Amino acid sequence: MEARDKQVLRSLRLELGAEVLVEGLVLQYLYQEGILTENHIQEINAQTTGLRKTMLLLDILPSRGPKAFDTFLDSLQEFPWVREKLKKAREEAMTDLPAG
Template sequence: MDPVHKDLLRKHTLDLCEDLLVSDTIVPFLYQEDILTAAQVDEVQSQSTDRKMNLKLLDILPNRGPRAFHCFMQALDLEFSWLKDRLLLDLRARTETGSSCSRLNETPAPGGHGDIWCLPCSLGQKIPSDQELSRLASLLGGEWEAVLMDLGVSAAALYRCRADHTLSHHGTTLAALLLWRQSEGKNATLHRLERSLQAAGVHPSVLKDVLL
């Protein structure tokens, strides 16, 4: 998990522990998305109170790989969207505060470990591949529609993508991203994606995971 995301969850531990009920939907969703193992599900659900279950989950999540934060955001969107919005608002504020100094002082390569990551200039005009768009589709949660609409994909086109992939969030998002790339041609660049991710409140480090 990105250090910025770890710090964000640590900062909001009290809020999350007081307001979440993880056993009904969040833990099963994270297991479904291969973020938690069966043993970790048992470990969380064996705790004696909801608060202890929340603490145990927040203790496990930071060590569950680069998809863990984004899948947790998707899980929150199922029943606790207001908590997700609070986290993303704080994340956006952190990104905006640190972005100017980050762009002046560093351009880490994909896979770097800076707390604030931005797209290296050398990759800005690259058109993302099918594989890279598939990775992005797996990382985007409830913000996917805002990202695609900022990219210029119409509401009608998004509706068709949902209708064609009713049982797959990944399939819906990937279909919309492929549609954007096809319609924009040489303008469908990583730099354009970065701008729309930021506009939708998605941390730019998502692209670091996409470009692995």
């Protein structure tokens, strides 16, 4: 049960985390919606480059954010390709019981 959203994060976390976005309204809808928090502020304000911001969510959701995904995706400045590949990892990254 408690390993579906966090599983997605980690997965696509490193994937798109390596390099995908460098700017675009995203964590703004989040930080506001609640996805984030003061704690994030520190991490998000920490980037110092641009690609970090992304890593951030991917770095926060896994620790600070139980149901921040659905919303963290609603931000996906590039959803068309980031959201798909994401929810894809929600279906894939999410440890499944079945097998075949």
